[PDB]
Design a binder for this molecule. Structure first.
Ligand SMILES: [K+]
Ligand SMILES: [K+]
Ligand SMILES: [K+]
Length: 757
DNA sequence: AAGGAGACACGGCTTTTGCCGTGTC
């Protein structure tokens, strides 16, 4: 299968490499014949000669238009005639560009920001990740020596761990006595051995967890300190650290660096995103964390290293298992979009739709819109509207089902033929007209985007049936991946339509989909209420929760399924709800916020978690305790007893001052800060006394009883004397603990006043 | 091997029915 593509310059000429793995054998194919190009639109077909002779100079050499060619295409369905301007080297384009545009005879340019290696994938109709191939895969993690305030990677790496189908192992430069540890002499040797293991195992995929930001950069700086040629590429080269806009991404040539963190962070909601959180959420069991200060100990002592190594072998073992769960999904998205898994797994859905469209656009000789310019952008961004809103029921409900709207939207786009090339077309036989908001969609021919969604959904239906004709759970799981990927992809078109940066943006389409949505959602709600006696507890843009007042779990579930058939059969054409889960009890605070608990007792929240940087254990501990009281034991009064008791204990200084410490971190030379928060004012005055304060320093403070700013009365927990000092219990109650729990409990009728003391 | 550019609430300040500067997930 194709794993990746890139190009290399040689003798000034571009060369495409296609990286494959076919029948257990890695190989690199070459293409020297692929010409870069853009599209230009001309006022008159004659001024071509003035253009076919434009030139700009970059990196010494002058750049010409190696060739022009007049070609006929479609732009948004309507025929268009443009000039396809060829070149010599990909890099020519971002330089000759604005000079071709500026020319008075040129109206516009198109398809001038498509990365050459991706341009290749599309035009030759090549598709990464297709075929039977068993890819060979390796997870790895490192565990470093850390002390607060050190420059990045000043500390040495202590261990490198790796795992795959054969098991996990650790490489460390210190004698430890476990059957999966490989002792070597130094860190320089540790690294070199890791490098050898990778070279020998030759994996197609290296799996990290945030390797994009930590591990690879660490290993880089260390390999420079110790003169190790850090070679992981299959063509003998080092990890290529790349800037993606806001963050970094690391590439290993001829392999697939699969960074789990951006995949899991897109996939699931979570307060935290640690390895041990992620592993737990997905697999059930917890992962016994072993902290940095606890690590530096066992190393500098030499005692309890056998613990610290178990942690590293598990980081690797865990990272592998997560990879194996998440890979087959990203692999499906890669096939579907037709781009490398290295790109796809790092993309937003907005961005998958875009690449998908770009490919299909080509398949259909359809010139692509350009991105928004800077003003056309801001114009869109001001014209923003959301989705379906509905007020929630107060109170704590039982046996609740959740039903999913997300699949309605692409069905709507298909059913009412919603797309920019069908929007307000003059002279049609038939129209669909969006409710409330009035946009007309031609119905004579299928539009571009409805056309392709029709194919995706058909494909999904085909897969879903094939799953029913198979008992083998391995093949069933594999098909299930394909089925869910399509759902993910298809369901991204709604947000995409009103996505300001989108090429095929269309406000009218988004509003139109929102209106038809409101209608079908409203119908569904009316149906489940009137005809099935459900009460709808909460409903937003992607689903609603509902129950039968007073019914029991078996009943509600039976009745929910019956409603699914009824409404799925009744709603027009391809429109269908989906049953996305059941919850023991739950409560719903506003348009956007709620908490529910399932039949295994896993609480889930939305818009309720403490999210502030300057939090405190006492705040977090109390909210946690409240939710458990409400959701797990269904006992609102206990939750009120608990909050009261905490506010009491607070004001009578009997809350362990530890629980009041706030950990905030320093990011720059204090000089540089343009404004001074508390933790910065604490630190600032520590520095005025010549104490070591560096980027990376964790300020740990209490707020004390007094007046005015929080900065003026926050002290280092270090300097806190229980005997002498008095904590600001008013702050901890009003600013910290109560805002964490107030919204939850007002929902049940309780006022702030009731929780106070 | 190529260009890209987010959401969200904190404390504090010649905006307690806002605009920064900030730095987390
Ligand atoms: K022009
Ligand atoms: K239907
Ligand atoms: K913090």
């Amino acid at each position: 299968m194709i794993l990746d593509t890139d190009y290399i310059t040689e003798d000034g000429k571009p060369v495409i490499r296609i990286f494959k793995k076919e029948n257990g054998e890695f190989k690199i194919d070459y293409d020297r014949n692929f010409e870069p190009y853009i599209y230009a639109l001309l006022k008159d077909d004659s001024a071509i000669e003035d253009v076919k002779k434009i030139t700009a100079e970059r990196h010494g050499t002058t750049v010409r238009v190696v060739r022009a060619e007049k070609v006929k295409k479609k732009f948004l369905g309507r025929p268009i005639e443009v000039w396809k301007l060829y070149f010599t080297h990909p890099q020519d384009v971002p330089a000759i560009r604005d000079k071709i545009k500026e020319h008075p005879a040129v109206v516009d340019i198109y398809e001038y920001d498509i990365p050459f290696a991706k341009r290749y994938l599309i035009d030759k109709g090549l598709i990464p990740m297709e075929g039977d191939e068993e890819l060979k895969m390796l997870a790895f993690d490192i565990e470093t020596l850390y002390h607060e305030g050190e420059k990045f990677a000043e500390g040495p790496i202590l261990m490198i761990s790796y795992a795959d189908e054969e098991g996990a192992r650790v490489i460390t430069w210190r004698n430890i006595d476990l059957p999966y540890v490989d002792v070597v002499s130094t860190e320089k040797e540790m690294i070199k051995r890791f490098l050898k293991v990778v070279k020998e195992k030759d994996p197609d995929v290296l799996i990290t967890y945030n390797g994009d930001n930590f591990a690879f950069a660490y290993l880089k700086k260390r390999s420079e300190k110790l003169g190790v040629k850090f070679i992981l590429g299959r063509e003998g080269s080092e990890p290529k650290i790349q800037r993606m806009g806001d963050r970094f991404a690391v590439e290993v040539k001829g392999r697939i660096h699969f960074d789990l963190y951006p995949v899991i962070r897109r996939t699931i909601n979570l307060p935290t995103y640690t390895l041990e959180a992620v592993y737990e959420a997905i697999f059930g069991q917890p992962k016994e964390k072993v902290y940095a200060e606890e690590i530096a100990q066992a190393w500098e002592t030499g005692e309890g290293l056998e613990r610290v190594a178990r942690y590293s072998m598990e980081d690797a073992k865990v990272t592998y298992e997560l990879g194996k769960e998440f890979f087959p999904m990203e692999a499906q998205l890669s096939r579907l979009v037709g781009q490398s898994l290295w790109d796809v797994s790092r993309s937003s859905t907005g961005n998958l739709v875009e690449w998908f469209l770009l490919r299909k656009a080509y398949e259909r000789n359809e010139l692509a819109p350009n991105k928004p310019d800077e003003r056309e952008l801001a114009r869109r961004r001001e014209s923003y509207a959301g989705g379906y809103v509905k007020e929630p029921e107060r109170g704590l409900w039982e046996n609740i089902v959740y039903l999913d709207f997300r699949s309605l939207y692409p069905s709507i786009i298909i059913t009412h033929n919603v797309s920019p090339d069908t929007l307000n077309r003059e002279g049609c036989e038939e129209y669909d007209v969006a409710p409330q908001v009035g946009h007309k969609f031609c119905k004579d021919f299928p539009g571009f985007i409805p056309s392709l969604l029709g194919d995706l959904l058909e494909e999904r239906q085909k897969v879903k049936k094939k799953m029913k004709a198979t008992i083998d759970p391995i093949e069933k799981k594999l098909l299930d991946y394909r089925q869910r990927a399509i759902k993910i992809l298809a369901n991204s078109f709604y947000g995409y339509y009103g996505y300001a940066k989108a090429r095929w943006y269309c406000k009218e389409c988004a509003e139109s989909v929102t209106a038809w949505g409101r209608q079908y959602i409203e119908t569904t709600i009316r149906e489940i209420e009137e005809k099935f006696g459900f009460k709808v507890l909460y409903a937003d843009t992607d689903g609603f929760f509902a129950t039968i007042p007073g019914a029991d779990a078996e009943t509600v579930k039976k009745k929910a399924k019956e409603f699914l058939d009824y409404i799925n059969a009744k709603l027009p054409g391809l429109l269908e709800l989906e049953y996305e889960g059941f919850y023991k009890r739950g409560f719903f605070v506003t348009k956007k916020k709620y908490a529910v608990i399932d039949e295994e007792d896993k609480i889930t929240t939305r818009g309720l978690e403490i999210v502030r940087r300057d939090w405190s254990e006492i705040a977090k501990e109390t909210q946690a305790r409240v939710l458990e009281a409400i959701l797990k034991h269904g006992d609102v009064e206990e939750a009120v007893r608990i909050v009261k008791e905490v506010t009491e204990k607070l004001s009578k200084y009997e809350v362990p001052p530890e629980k009041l410490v706030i950990y905030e971190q320093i990011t720059r030379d204090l000089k540089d800060y343009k404004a001074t928060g508390p933790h910065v004012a604490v630190a600032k005055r520590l520095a005025a006394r010549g104490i070591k304060i560096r980027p990376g320093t964790v300020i740990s403070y209490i707020v004390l009883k007094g007046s005015g700013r929080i900065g003026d009365r926050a002290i280092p927990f270090d300097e806190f004397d229980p005997a002498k000092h008095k904590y600001d219990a008013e702050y901890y109650i009003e600013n910290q603990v109560l805002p964490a729990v107030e919204r939850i409990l007002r929902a049940f009728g309780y006022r702030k006043e009731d929780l106070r003391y």
